[PDB]
């Protein structure tokens, strides 16, 4: 009933989403679905459209600390559905009424810490969503691609291969893929976010950065699929103006690009 209430309250009330219509969010995050808008009990889809309809709404400047304090609270939860949808919520909540956040030096830092934090979670889906929203916050320039950002991503890319445990495989020691490979996937996924944040232009930092992703093709799954989707998505959008995109690369960097096999399983 209160979900159908916030549904109608989203576009009608003068001060949308008061500070106690905000503790209703972390309970609504863990019950919303992830992928599809298909028929889920009329309460999941009711919570999905309510969350989509409520990020899309103006905030006050005194209110952007409070919502982001709610968001980093329920991005620290144990529900990966919740951590996915706080990261889609942040994704719509920033760009709609984006400056309000840019006129806060502590909110931009809180959002970048939140997206870098969720970029290294145990669920692959929320890691992919954090890469998508990092790449989108970096595209609109809300978030700047720092030199500490490159240092953090490249220091995550060099973690180690975990030296796969021959313990038959343990006794009961699994169900979580790793603590080591999740860091390499986080770092590669952040570099992919940075090279996908510039879809139609190669900047000066991209050619050196894109050579780093080329060293992670044969890096095992899930890092392989992230590299392949990232570089396929790269060169499907950089072909329309490639005669001046190629000039930012060196001749020893265009040769490395064409020697990439980023092609799906229904090839070869």
């Amino acid at each position: 009933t209160i979900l159908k209430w916030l549904m109608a309250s989203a576009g009608r009330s003068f001060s949308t989403a008061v500070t106690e219509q905000l503790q209703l969010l972390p309970l609504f995050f863990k019950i919303a679905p992830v992928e599809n808008d298909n028929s889920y009990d009329e309460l999941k889809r009711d919570a999905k459209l309510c969350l989509s309809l409520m990020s899309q709404g103006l905030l006050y400047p005194h209110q952007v600390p409070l919502v982001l304090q709610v968001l980093k609270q329920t991005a620290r939860s144990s529900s990966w559905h919740a951590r996915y949808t706080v990261l889609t919520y942040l994704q719509t909540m920033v760009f709609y009424n984006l400056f309000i956040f840019l006129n806060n030096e502590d909110a931009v830092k809180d959002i970048r810490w939140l997206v870098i934090s969720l970029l290294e979670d145990e669920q692959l889906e929320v890691r992919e969503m954090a890469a998508t929203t990092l790449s989108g916050l970096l595209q609109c320039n809300f978030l700047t691609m720092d030199s500490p950002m490159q240092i953090h991503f490249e220091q995550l890319c060099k973690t180690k291969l975990p030296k796969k445990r021959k313990r038959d495989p343990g006794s009961v020691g699994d169900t979580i893929p790793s603590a080591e490979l999740v860091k390499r996937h986080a770092g590669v996924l952040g570099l992919g976010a940075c090279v996908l944040s510039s879809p139609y232009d190669v900047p000066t930092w991209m050619p050196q950065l894109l050579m780093n992703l080329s060293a992670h093709l044969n890096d095992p799954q899930p890092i392989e699929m992230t590299v392949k989707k990232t570089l396929s998505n790269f060169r499907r959008t950089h072909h329309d103006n490639w005669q001046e995109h190629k000039q930012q690369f060196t001749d020893d960097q265009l040769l490395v690009l064409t020697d990439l096999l980023v092609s799906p399983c229904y090839y070869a």
Binding site: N218, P220, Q221, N241, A268
Partner: protein, 240 residues
């Protein structure tokens, strides 16, 4: 941005005299993993490198049986390679049924090229996004054929198709002066060293990713898979 008026369908000539859909299908084969084919005086060996969707999946096949004397290897869309295998297997069956003899490999390759020219010229149908590498043995000795999405077919001393197969062609053109006088094991090791040079620096030829297909004079076409490539790979040298 630079949007092209002429790369819409295959039945459109550009004013530069080109057909861009044929050209764009020509690099559907560089979307496939590398494959080396090479022949001696007595044998023709197809060596291919194959990849897996995961560590739990089982390494997509690239060498395919066509007859007892013809075996091909594929690079590009494996859905078009299946159409081509079904066609080529049926042509081999038809002329072993009518004439009770194996196909000349060049006649089947000509017949493939006549098949694949038809979607390069007729509307609403794409060129075949696969290139084949065709080993065969017949009365004229062993044969290595390359067919491309441009419906152009090539009679080869040795050839590599697939992604970053330039380096294998740099190997093969350098070493083709001694392919004919090889025995079987040295010809397979030449094909492996050509395939091993289509690799990055951390990767190596293992029993899971290497598939070897050999036809010869007194040998029918046989695909050597996982355990069977161990005699062929445990005689090579370390990567230079």
């Amino acid at each position: 941005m630079f949007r092209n008026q002429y790369d819409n369908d295959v039945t459109v000539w550009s004013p530069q005299g080109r057909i861009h859909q044929i050209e764009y299908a020509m690099e559907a084969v560089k979307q496939g993993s590398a494959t080396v084919g090479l022949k001696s005086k007595t044998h023709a060996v197809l060596v291919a490198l194959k990849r897996a969707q995961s560590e739990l999946a089982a390494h997509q096949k690239k060498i395919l049986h066509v007859d007892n004397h013809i075996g091909i290897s594929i690079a590009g869309l494996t859905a078009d390679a299946r159409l081509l295998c079904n066609f080529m297997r049926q042509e081999c069956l038809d002329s072993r049924f009518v004439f009770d003899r194996p196909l000349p490999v060049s006649r089947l390759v000509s017949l493939i090229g006549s098949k694949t020219q038809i979607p390069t010229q007729r509307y609403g149908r794409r060129p075949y996004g696969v290139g084949l590498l065709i080993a065969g043995y017949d009365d004229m000795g062993p044969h290595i054929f390359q067919t491309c999405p441009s419906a152009n077919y090539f009679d080869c001393r040795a050839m590599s198709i697939g992604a970053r197969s330039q380096s294998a062609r740099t190997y093969l053109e350098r070493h083709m002066s001694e392919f004919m006088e090889c025995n079987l094991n040295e010809l397979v090791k030449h094909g492996l060293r050509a395939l091993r040079e289509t690799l990055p620096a951390e990767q190596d030829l293992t029993t899971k990713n290497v598939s070897i297909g050999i036809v010869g004079k007194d040998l029918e076409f046989t695909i050597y898979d996982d355990d069977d490539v161990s005699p062929f790979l445990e005689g090579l040298e370390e990567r230079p």
